[PDB]
Amino acid sequence: SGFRKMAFPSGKVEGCMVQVTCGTTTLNGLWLDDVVYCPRHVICTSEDMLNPNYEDLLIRKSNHNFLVQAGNVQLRVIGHSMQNCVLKLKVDTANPKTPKYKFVRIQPGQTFSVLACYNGSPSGVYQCAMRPNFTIKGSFLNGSCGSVGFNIDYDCVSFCYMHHMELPTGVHAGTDLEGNFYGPFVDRQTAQAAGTDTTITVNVLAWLYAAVINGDRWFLNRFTTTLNDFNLVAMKYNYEPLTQDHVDILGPLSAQTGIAVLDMCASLKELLQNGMNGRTILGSALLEDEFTPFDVVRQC
Amino acid sequence: SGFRKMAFPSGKVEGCMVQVTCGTTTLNGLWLDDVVYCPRHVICTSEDMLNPNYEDLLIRKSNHNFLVQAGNVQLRVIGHSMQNCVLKLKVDTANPKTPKYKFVRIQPGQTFSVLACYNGSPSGVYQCAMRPNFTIKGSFLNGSCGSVGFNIDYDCVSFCYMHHMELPTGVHAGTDLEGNFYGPFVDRQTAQAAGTDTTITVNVLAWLYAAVINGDRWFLNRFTTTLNDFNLVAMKYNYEPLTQDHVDILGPLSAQTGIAVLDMCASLKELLQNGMNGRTILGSALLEDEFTPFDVVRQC
């Protein structure tokens, strides 16, 4: 038993991490088949970042201006193109370590594993959730841009996130692997507002289910509530609204734990209205929301 | 920036995870060169676990009683031996994916990454700390025994933990890779007392340094204290004592943050005596102790 924030094993993505250098700027890229994907602002100097015109800047770049290194081995760039906010570098060799993969755009509230990298070599891995305001609370120093996020289904890596920037507020922003940013953000150094970071309610409920399964039960009450009554209280406390879809998703936890979802919803209300009073659930003094119901089920 | 609980990339250990079956019992083993390491209680039935005599039980086992599978490929067992609480299975092929490795016994308070596995296939990875009472608070379902813990230094995997059991209290226990258990525990199904789980003080201080570096500063006071005066308060709150060794280790964080260790010690006193009052540090309502000062430095 036990319950841990767990990332997917990173070996399959590790074999895709390379170093991309363009001028004085080095970030990471994703080498899948014969294409390297990296943040387009690899072509930016620090002063370009204030207001870059990527098409004008990219015209000044040639294939030979792009140094791509996979470990110590140098790939020959034979094409370059801009997919929205991502550069696609055609290289001369297909990655023999290309895993089976797909590119996916995940929804707010979904979780993924990040392989944080520097100079194309993997440094660490951790599990993160896509905030409702389309930011992530990651750990990214200079040079980590282009590190990717992914989920794994059996033998397939689903790439869902590539990192591009830290907003002046300290939160992190990026794109899917076709380069469309999550949220209204762009790869330019300007003040950029992140939304109210509301709480992912469905994830909180799943974690309570995880807690009940792991024997933390003190927060169970015998109350119930309705879905609309609960959601009225949820908004005041900056929680995302709960939908029937979410109730549907929690069914297996509802069925496995013998605790009806609306009973579980009622317990959360009491935690919201009364705080935890310094008690803990699964070793945390806060309601945890970076576990999806799938995360809980997989681990359980 | 940002600060996350981060595990080491798991790819190098992933390539070592195999399935070991003995009778009706299946756990994981570590295939390094031509030796597979696994928990010796793979040879136990459920009823043996109550009071196993491993030498008498192992005499009844032959090399052919041990099925070892690396993915779909079957290894030929050509020798078996018991290193304390670990079985060493000599197999007929050296793992071509054996990374550079060493076996190390870590100290209480040190952290490591766990690659949780089932049927020899990696499931997830998370960062854990060795509790002062030589347990870990992991996430281990049935079949995860033999999953290993490790740190990485450049290209070398330091194996420090192999999982053997969950104590009736829900915490987890295991061995170094020569099979000597951490703590007074044995691989038998009996009530086994874990110690008072005291808090790893040096780790708490490092995380505060991580917090100050990441801009969480509200907990800084302008007080100082002495080392003995601080430790008097620490014991009452079930914190491990702070040594000069630990002060020495925190030097770089003290030097990087401009906050003297004893000033940082004084701040912790105030958090201990006053609680956090519902405020947060690095998004946590509790003092976090599963980051060593090295963990902080690496990430920073």
CATH number at residue B282: 1.10.1840.10
Give the DSSP per-residue string, B93-110: S--TTPPEEEE--PPTT-
Closest to A205 measured CA to CA, from A237, A164, A239: A239
Angle at the Cα of A102 (from A160 to A69), degrees rounded to 5? 80
B174 and B112 Cβ atoms separated by less than 8 Å? no
Query: Which candidate in A22, A38, A85, A145 is catalytic?
Result: A145
Active site residue B172: no
What's the token pair of residue B113? 């990454």
Q: Are strands A156-166 and A100-103 parallel, antiparallel or unpaired?
A: parallel
Task: Give which of A111, A118, A139, A292 to mutate to test B binding, by max B Cβ within 10 Å.
Answer: A139
Task: Give which of A3, A8, A10, A154 to mutate to test B binding, by max B Cβ within 10 Å.
Answer: A10
* End-to-end CA, chain B: 8
Phi and psi torsions of B130, nearest 5° = -60, 110
A170 and A253 Cβ atoms separated by less than 8 Å? no
Distance of residue A169 Cα from the nearest chain B Cα, in angstroms: 10
Tally the residues of chain A. Answer: 300
* Element at B213 (helix H, strand E): helix B201-213
A4 and B138 Cβ atoms separated by less than 8 Å? yes
Phi and psi torsions of B39, nearest 5° = -65, 135
Active site residue A265: no
Phi and psi torsions of A160, nearest 5° = -120, -15
* End-to-end CA, chain A: 8
Query: Which candidate in A41, A80, A163, A246 is catalytic?
Result: A41
Task: Give which of B3, B6, B112 to mutate to test A binding, by max A Cβ within 10 Å.
Answer: B6
Residues belonging to chain A with any Cβ–Cβ distance to chain B shorter than 8 Å? 1-12, 14-15, 115-116, 122-128, 137-141, 166, 170-172, 214-215, 275, 278, 280, 283-286, 298-300
Tally the residues of chain B. Answer: 300
Query: Which candidate in B22, B41, B80, B163 is catalytic?
Result: B41
Distance of residue A80 Cα from the nearest chain B Cα, in angstroms: 30
Q: Which residues of B touch A12 (CB under 8 A)?
A: 11
What is the rounded CA–CA span in Å between residue A56 and residue A225?
Answer: 58
- Residue A271's alpha-carbon distances to A267, B12, B170, in angstroms, are 6, 42, 25
Range of the domain at B280: 201-299
Resolution in A: 2.7
B252 and B293 Cβ atoms separated by less than 8 Å? yes
Distance of residue B62 Cα from the nearest chain A Cα, in angstroms: 32
Question: Does the CA dihedral B93-B114-B105-B152 come out positive or negative?
Answer: positive
